């Protein structure tokens, strides 16, 4: 049911970016395709998308702290559940890193979340509801 070049999971469709852009330009691009940036709700959704990423690249996610107050918000305005997050050790790390990416670290090997700069172009993941 999903369009061309979109992975399928549950009742949604997910696009794994190859081009890089800023966080807002990435959300605008997901909106052009009638979607939003990735909003991770269940661990089954999280492990599915880790499986489909370049381990050597970071991927933008619809979680941001626009004020720097460490008040993380999903773009679909669903509640942020602190205890069920996938942060790497020591992250979040910088109040000026206000945008969340998925990235694979090498020692020890782990998939997780990391806060990075928002203007610095990265890859992205769009979530489209079907
Ligand atoms: Ca989701
Ligand atoms: Ca960081």
Curated annotation (Swiss-Prot):
Up-regulation conditions: TNF alpha, IL-1 alpha, and LPS, down-regulated expression at the surface of neutrophils (at protein level). Expression is decreased in dendritic cells by signals inducing their maturation (e.g. CD40 ligand, TLR9 ligands, LPS, and TNF alpha). Isoform 2: mRNA expression is up-regulated by agonists of neutrophils CSF2/GM-CSF, IL3/interleukin-3, IL4/interleukin-4 and IL13/interleukin-13.
Membrane topology value: Single-pass type II membrane protein
Positions that bind N-acetyl-D-glucosamine: 103-105
Main localisation: membrane
Glycosylation sites: 81
Extracellular domain ranges by topology: 2-130
Residues in C-type lectin domain copies: 9-127
Expressed in which tissues: Expressed preferentially in hematopoietic tissues. Expressed in all circulating Ag-presenting cells such as dendritic cells, myeloid cells, monocytes, macrophages, B-cells and epidermal Langerhans cells (at protein level). Expressed in peripheral blood leukocytes, neutrophils, moderate quantities in spleen, lymph node, and bone marrow, and at very low levels in thymus.
Assigned GO CC terms: external side of plasma membrane; plasma membrane
Binding site for Ca(2+) 2: 91, 93, 97, 114-115
GO aspect biological process, one term: CD8-positive, alpha-beta T cell activation
Residues noted as binding alpha-D-mannopyranose in the record, renumbered to the chain: 91-93, 97
Localization, UniProt: Cell membrane
Keywords, sorted A to Z: Adaptive immunity, Calcium, Cell membrane, Disulfide bond, Glycoprotein, Host-virus interaction, Immunity, Innate immunity, Lectin, Membrane, Metal-binding, Signal-anchor, Transmembrane, Transmembrane helix
GO MF annotation: an example: pattern recognition receptor activity
Domain of life: Eukaryota
UniProt binding sites for Ca(2+) 1: 39, 41, 45, 127
Disulfide bond entries: 2-13, 30-126, 99-118
Function: C-type lectin receptor that binds carbohydrates mannose and fucose but also weakly interacts with N-acetylglucosamine (GlcNAc) in a Ca(2+)-dependent manner. Involved in regulating immune reactivity. Once triggered by antigen, it is internalized by clathrin-dependent endocytosis and delivers its antigenic cargo into the antigen presentation pathway resulting in cross-priming of CD8(+) T cells. This cross-presentation and cross-priming are enhanced by TLR7 and TLR8 agonists with increased expansion of the CD8(+) T cells, high production of IFNG and TNF with reduced levels of IL4, IL5 and IL13. (Microbial infection) Involved in the interaction between HIV-1 virus and dendritic cells. Enhances HIV-1 binding/entry and virus infection. Requires ITIM motif-associated signal transduction pathway involving phosphatases PTPN6 and PTPN11, SYK, Src kinases and MAP kinases.
Record's subunit section: May interact with PTPN6 via its ITIM motif.
Domain-level remarks: Contains 1 copy of a cytoplasmic motif that is referred to as the immunoreceptor tyrosine-based inhibitor motif (ITIM). This motif is involved in modulation of cellular responses. The phosphorylated ITIM motif can bind the SH2 domain of several SH2-containing phosphatases. Involved in the interaction between HIV-1 virus and dendritic cells. Enhances HIV-1 binding/entry and virus infection. Requires ITIM motif-associated signal transduction pathway involving phosphatases PTPN6 and PTPN11, SYK, Src kinases and MAP kinases.
Name of the featured protein: C-type lectin domain family 4 member A
Organism: Homo sapiens
Covered range of the whole protein: 106 to 234 of 237
